[PDB]
Design a protein around this ligand. Structure first.
Ligand SMILES: CCCCCCCCCCCCO[C@@H]1O[C@H](CO)[C@@H](O[C@H]2O[C@H](CO)[C@@H](O)[C@H](O)[C@H]2O)[C@H](O)[C@H]1O
Ligand SMILES: CCCCCCCCCCCCO[C@@H]1O[C@H](CO)[C@@H](O[C@H]2O[C@H](CO)[C@@H](O)[C@H](O)[C@H]2O)[C@H](O)[C@H]1O
Ligand SMILES: CCCCCCCCCCCCO[C@@H]1O[C@H](CO)[C@@H](O[C@H]2O[C@H](CO)[C@@H](O)[C@H](O)[C@H]2O)[C@H](O)[C@H]1O
Lengths: 1030, 200, 100, 100, 50, 50
């Protein structure tokens, strides 16, 4: 095929031109974002049952929805939480590759089937189904500077002022506001109520009946007798617009002819629906929006958009209203695609140099400078074809890919000119000639490389998602460069290169080059001699190969098994949990202190703190709060001290004191979706509908047995533990004795204590809620329970003191279910040095000593680990078996193939060493870079064994053919390894945004290259000669 | 439409949703109501199912479920003064008129309120005068749109949005197609000479 | 009846969430609280099934009570706990002792 | 309800959810004094109408709870808009036996 | 490049399709019996003349 | 899907009351196994007769 295009350079150009345009166009349309959809798609169903308890929601709401959650496609598992505030959440988890769109719909439809089956108060509340995945683009903060406005005041602002405009800017997807719009809240005074002998329940029905937009008829509606000439219509009543009107509803008319109104009973004013979580951004209250990138959009353009938009609004915003941007992902996304176009440009730069050095022609310099961008552009087109995105994993994929891209250029250009040099043929004939030599091995290597990468793409789970990204991207490049290096470069050589006279090696060139050509000329001879002696004394060396091999298997058993790398995303988490009971004041101050310590001791690294109460990563409720510590830009805090991982250290030190709460500091997962990386998780669950306190036993025997275990460390329980609960106990007898109905006693303890969603009023146009509830001071202490009176059999108001009797029992403030059954989630890590597989092995032993009736099931990355894990050996054996076969054909022997495969280890140790010398781990970035390196290493070997057997065929001796090959191949392999190590160095030493991953690749790459370049050249011939003999 | 009727380019220039229509009211104070013993459970759900109607029950009719409806008599339901004719029971027994227990005024509503892309607007159609073409037509409009208050913008929709599309593609179109014919001729005839001469 | 109740309360939903099953029919029921009225008694105490029902509807209820640490709270408050009102019944004894 | 109280209690709020759907070309809502509402979402010239529907639905499952207690009862219809009528099949009374 | 810039831009050719539509928009609030009259004169002008 | 249901119930068996055993009254899949496995058998026969 190449000899064909060599005579058709224009055709050859036109093909390079098209593969260019496609790519060029495609890079436009192509979406841009930080990660693919690596997480298992999940849908969240959520309601709050105002004033309910954790049981009065799992038993009346959760259990119900669950019993209708079946017959959904691609369901993996399903897990729910029901907690101490009204809130509930059921999360349905689907297998990878599942259209979130139909998952959602399927799940929401089954939700409908069970809606009428649900408590009418919940029913009226409105149940939300949502895509429950944390790909948050940015997070907009909206704060009150002068403390004038509350969370409630603010969330209403962004709902009526900056929610519409936000939703209408390009690339804006699923956003979620912190807080609801407004709602007429009223607060009944029990004392003041008892006075006019009025019950809470009255106020309710009062407002239900006095606030309605009644159905209006038509004046002239059909049918109608002749004469009809006005078909106009009428408008019925109207709903209450102001809180003032909510004070004018007659509750009672006394015998005195007096009017009793709501004012004389409660205070009426605008507020919020739920008061369960408080958010402060630097002391002062605030709310905001968590924005998600529209599916298919450009993370850069869209971040700019949702920025100018809430900037064309800052003028109109009230005083104190300042907008902040706490969390934002486009910085890193922008960075890790600057640091790609960079290392790409410098790659082709370094190539032009290293090309010039060893060669002469500025012309030979031109070939690789065309053939490489051409392959990059096109490589993008292939991504479009496969519906992939320009993303963090997808771009690094191209970084690792130029090692291979750069080769196929210089391997082809160097070789044409070697032929030209040692045979004095013309550009064409020497093009024609070398393409005869290499052609087949090129087709050959393109397949071998394919078997080397592709397998990983057949991995299941989220690890398979990230792998697949690298694989598909670096195979597209490889294959595409092989075609360009068959129909483009050969013509380019044939056309652009100048001729050189036989035997000329530039030795008498004088100048610096003269020195160089001479020096290299001598050094190659040295090499030949090295190899020559290695072939004349095989055994000993063969032995030392075994040794270095042994050391490779050693290094694997002594290298951190960690998941993907750890970066420094400008955020630090602080999870606060004050003791059982506690309050939205206590916890709210424990965290209020955390802001100071950070903004008064770590102000060298911490920009701002966003704090929250009544909400954790392990539970909702007052005995739990959080702080999202945001760090100064990457530059403005260099030095290992100002690193998230060092910030976290000091934090936990200082925070270790507090003998009230229980503060913890840590950094988010590498990829921000339930990333325990190296850390298992699990659900204990009672298949046999045994007690709940039997579960507690089961859990507690677990933990108090995981400690008595070597294999595991840091086995905590996820989710809060039992708190003291105040159990009421109304007397069904004494109640009727006095003459009070149970209906009134409950309905009264309801609206008084727990909220009550009552009626809809409209203001500013939009319909907002109306919440009836007792005074704060009227429900703070057990005694306040008495302040509430119910109307008796008739006339007289009876106090709770009568029938109500309290007790303090224990209960759970957060009930958990997993797969329809109640469960308790527990986390944990393997002991230092041990693997998750070891951890799980041990856990599976300390589960058999559990209360008969309790079971378990892996759920998180654990569920995945155990799956992808089973297929690993299969896939390896497959790439092994396929790589062999391909070599077998390339050489026409079942033997010499081994002479290329035994090269693998040579380059591996280099990577391992460097990786440990740098104190890193088995990052996916290392894991992949390790394949990208035994790629080149292989390519290098296949071409030298190729040339070797060609000579042995022209009738030279194995030993001679070996050394003659090596001599022929040395120059090229030196120029790629030189070109490449230098190209990657910058990454190995990068500092700042995303540097942490750029370290994972470069570190092991240079380690792999260096060790594989040096070692391959000596041992490959050893291998070839060795096997040819045996 | 002022200018649209004058401008010699367009015709049949309609609107959608005419001007504002005449409507009424039913102001009713819970005062006089609870005066002669009448809560907001009767007077509320009695005006509705009298002047309009009221879906009450299902009923079989030759095997096909249908509906029973409650409307007031066409005689007393067709005019303003026909309001008083309706009486509501007392919390005590007697009856109550709409006289001193309900008033009716007179306002202007609006048959349809239209929006496009989260914004109040109004659809307006029109054909192009004989001889001229859609483009010629869209040309005229484009100018008599500036003669509108600085805040009343516009946008094309439907069949006109579609025309703006094909117009704003032709350039790219012709380009890429020329570009292809050039390349293919180039590759085909291993030349830059005869492609370039074909183009001309 | 014993067996039927296992199936439904225990293996039914897992099965109904097993990959590939799109529908299922059980040959039996799971348990339920059975109230067997007897007019030979209803009559005596001059009572109707309607009077029953409405009782069950009011005496076997899971109710939205509230909490002592009520949010929004009052300044200084330092005691928060869920108060649990009436919670529905499990045993027949509980169902037998409801006042009509 | 008035054409003004409708576009402000229903229309206005569902658009804020229709905003940002895949391939959304444009949206045109309509509020009438019949109490009748009807918003129309036109997608781009090649998108799958089913997922388009499935999507629109998915967004409504988020605006509904903000709707008047009344509307939430009725049931909002989602259906594929066509401007065409294929043909009208009619029937006339050939005598006088039947009326309009 | 002259001719091109001086020919009328269009989309699709108008086409006689053996069909026509007549929308009657009688004044606001007018009676159902009032519209029905205007719509009957349609039939006349059409069914009887053209 | 049959292989799956047996994975679910065999995952729930150790929590059933000591006394009862899960049985399989009516099952169509066993024939699908048998029938294909039978053709597989007639392969080794054909390939061998040929
Ligand atoms: C990350 C922690 C572990 C996972 C689970 C928790 C994740 C974080 C959830 C935060 C939810 C925040 O945002 C929420 O906004 C809505 C209004 O839109 C109201 O909360 C409510 O929304 C609607 C009312 O609109 C209620 O019917 C719903 O039952 C309730 O959840 C509150 O204002 C606030 O709770
Ligand atoms: C120029 C490039 C040319 C080639 C381009 C295309 C390359 C395609 C490579 C293979 C893609 C494989 O796609 C991937 O297959 C695996 C199974 O193997 C699926 O995963 C599924 O099967 C595996 C294996 O039984 C299970 O363990 C796993 O639990 C399951 O979900 C992935 O969800 C799917 O996405
Ligand atoms: C360019 C188009 C190419 C089309 C052909 C591509 C072949 C690509 C390389 C091989 C891909 C193999 O796909 C892979 O097969 C193995 C074996 O069945 C599956 O693995 C499963 O079966 C094998 C055999 O029972 C078990 O030993 C293994 O434990 C199990 O998990 C992998 O989970 C799946 O991902």
């Amino acid at each position: 095929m190449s000899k064909f295009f060599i005579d058709r350079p224009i055709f050859a150009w036109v093909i390079a031109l098209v593969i260019m345009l496609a790519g060029g166009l495609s890079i436009l349309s192509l979406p841009v974002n930080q990660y693919p959809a690596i997480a298992p798609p999940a849908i969240a169903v959520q309601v709050s049952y105002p004033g309910a308890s954790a049981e009065t929601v799992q038993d009346t709401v959760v259990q119900v929805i669950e019993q209708q959650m079946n017959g959904i496609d691609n369901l993996r598992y399903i897990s729910s939480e029901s907690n101490s505030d009204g809130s509930m959440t059921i999360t349905v988890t689907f297998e990878q590759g599942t259209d979130p769109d139909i998952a959602q719909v399927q799940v929401q439809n089954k939700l409908q089937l069970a809606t009428p089956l649900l408590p009418q108060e919940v029913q009226r509340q409105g149940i939300r189904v949502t895509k429950a995945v944390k790909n948050f683009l940015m997070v907009v903060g909206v704060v009150s500077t002068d403390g004038s406005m509350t969370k409630e005041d603010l969330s209403n602002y962004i709902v009526s002022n900056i929610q519409d405009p936000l939703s209408r800017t390009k690339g804006v997807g699923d956003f979620q506001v912190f807080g609801s719009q407004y709602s007429m809240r009223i607060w009944l005074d029990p004392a003041k109520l008892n006075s006019y002998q009025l019950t809470p329940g009255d106020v309710s029905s009062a407002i239900q009946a006095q606030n309605v937009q009644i159905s209006s008829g038509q004046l002239g509606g059909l049918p109608a007798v002749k004469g009809q000439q006005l078909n106009a219509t009428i408008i019925g009543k109207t709903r209450l617009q102001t809180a003032e009107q909510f004070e004018n509803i007659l509750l009672k008319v006394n015998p005195d002819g007096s009017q009793v109104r709501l004012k004389d009973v409660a205070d009426v004013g605008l507020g919020g629906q739920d008061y369960s979580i408080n958010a402060q951004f630097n002391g002062s209250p605030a709310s905001g929006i968590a924005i998600k990138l529209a599916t298919g959009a450009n993370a850069l353009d869209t971040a700019k958009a949702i920025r100018q938009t809430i900037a064309n609004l800052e003028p109109f915003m009230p005083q104190g209203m300042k907008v902040v941007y706490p969390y934002d992902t486009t910085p890193v996304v922008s960075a890790s695609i600057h640091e790609v176009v960079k290392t790409l440009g410098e790659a082709i730069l370094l190539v032009f140099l290293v090309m010039y050095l060893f060669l002469q022609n500025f012309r030979a310099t031109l070939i690789p400078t065309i053939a490489v961008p051409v392959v990059l552009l096109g490589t993008f087109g292939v991504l479009a074809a496969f519906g992939f995105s320009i993303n963090t994993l997808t771009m690094f994929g191209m970084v690792l890919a130029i090692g291979l891209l750069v080769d196929d250029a210089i391997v082809v250009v160097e070789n044409v000119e070697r032929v030209m040099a040692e045979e004095g043929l013309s550009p064409r004939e020497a093009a024609r000639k070398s393409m005869g030599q290499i052609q087949g091995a090129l087709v050959g290597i393109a397949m071998v490389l394919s078997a080397v990468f592709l397998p990983m793409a057949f991995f299941g789970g989220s690890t398979g998602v990230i792998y697949r990204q690298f694989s598909i991207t670096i195979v597209s490049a490889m294959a595409l460069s092989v075609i360009v290096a068959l129909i483009l470069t050969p013509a380019l050589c044939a056309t652009m290169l100048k001729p050189i006279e036989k035997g000329d090696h530039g030795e008498h060139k004088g100048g610096f080059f003269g020195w160089f050509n001479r020096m290299f000329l001598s050094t190659t001879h040295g090499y030949e001699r090295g190899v020559a002696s290695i072939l004349k004394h095989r055994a000993p060396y063969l032995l030392i190969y075994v040794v270095i091999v042994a050391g490779m298997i050693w290094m694997f058993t002594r290298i951190p098994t960690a998941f993907l790398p750890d970066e420094d995303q400008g955020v630090l988490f602080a999870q606060v949990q004050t003791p059982p009971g506690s309050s939205a004041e206590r916890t709210q101050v424990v965290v209020d202190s955390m802001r100071e310590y950070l903004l008064e001791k770590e102000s060298s690294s911490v920009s701002s703190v966003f704090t929250v109460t009544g909400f954790n990563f392990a539970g909702r409720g007052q005995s739990s709060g959080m702080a999202f510590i945001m760090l100064k830009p990457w530059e403005e805090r260099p030095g290992g001290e100002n690193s998230v991982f060092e910030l976290a250290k000091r934090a936990q030190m200082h925070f270790f004191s507090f003998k009230d709460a229980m503060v913890f500091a840590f950094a988010p997962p590498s990829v921000l979706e339930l990333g325990n990386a190296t850390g298992f998780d699990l659900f204990l669950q009672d298949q046999a509908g045994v007690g709940h306190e039997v579960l507690l036993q089961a859990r507690n025997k677990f933990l108090m047995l995981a400690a008595q275990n070597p294999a595991l460390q840091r086995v905590r329980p996820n989710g809060m533990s039992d708190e003291p609960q105040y159990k009421l106990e109304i007397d069904d007898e004494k109640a009727s004795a006095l003459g009070v109905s149970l209906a009134d006693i409950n309905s009264t303890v309801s609206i008084a204590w727990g909220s009550s969603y009552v009626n809809d009023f409209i203001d500013r146009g939009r319909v907002k809620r109306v919440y009836l509830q007792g005074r704060p001071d009227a429900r703070m202490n057990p005694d306040d329970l008495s302040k509430w009176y119910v109307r008796n059999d008739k006339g007289e108001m009876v106090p709770f003191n009568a029938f109500a009797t309290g007790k303090w029992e224990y209960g759970s403030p957060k009930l958990e279910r997993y797969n329809g059954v109640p469960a308790m989630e527990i986390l944990g890590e393997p002991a230092p040095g041990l693997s998750s597989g070891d951890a799980m092995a041990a856990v599976e032993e300390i589960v058999k000593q559990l209360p008969k009736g309790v079971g378990y099931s892996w759920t998180g990355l654990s569920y995945e680990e155990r799956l992808s894990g089973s297929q690993a050996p299969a896939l390896y054996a497959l790439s092994l078996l396929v790589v062999f076969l391909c070599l077998a054909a390339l050489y026409e022997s079942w033997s010499i193939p081994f002479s290329v495969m035994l090269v693998v280890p040579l380059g591996v140790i280099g990577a391992l060493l460097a990786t440990s010398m740098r104190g890193l781990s088995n990052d996916v970035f290392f894991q992949v870079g390790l394949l990208t390196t035994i790629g080149l290493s292989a390519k290098n070997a296949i071409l030298i064994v190729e040339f070797a057997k060609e000579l042995h065929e022209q009738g030279k001796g194995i030993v001679e053919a070996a050394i003659e090959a090596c001599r022929m191949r040395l120059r090229p392999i030196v120029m790629t390894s030189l070109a490449f190590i230098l190209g990657v160095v910058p990454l190995a030493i990068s500092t700042g945004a995303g540097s942490g991953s750029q370290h994972a690749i470069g570190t092991g790459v240079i380690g792999g290259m260096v060790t594989a370049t040096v070692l391959a050249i000596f041992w490959v011939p050893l291998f070839y000669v060795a096997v040819s003999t045996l």
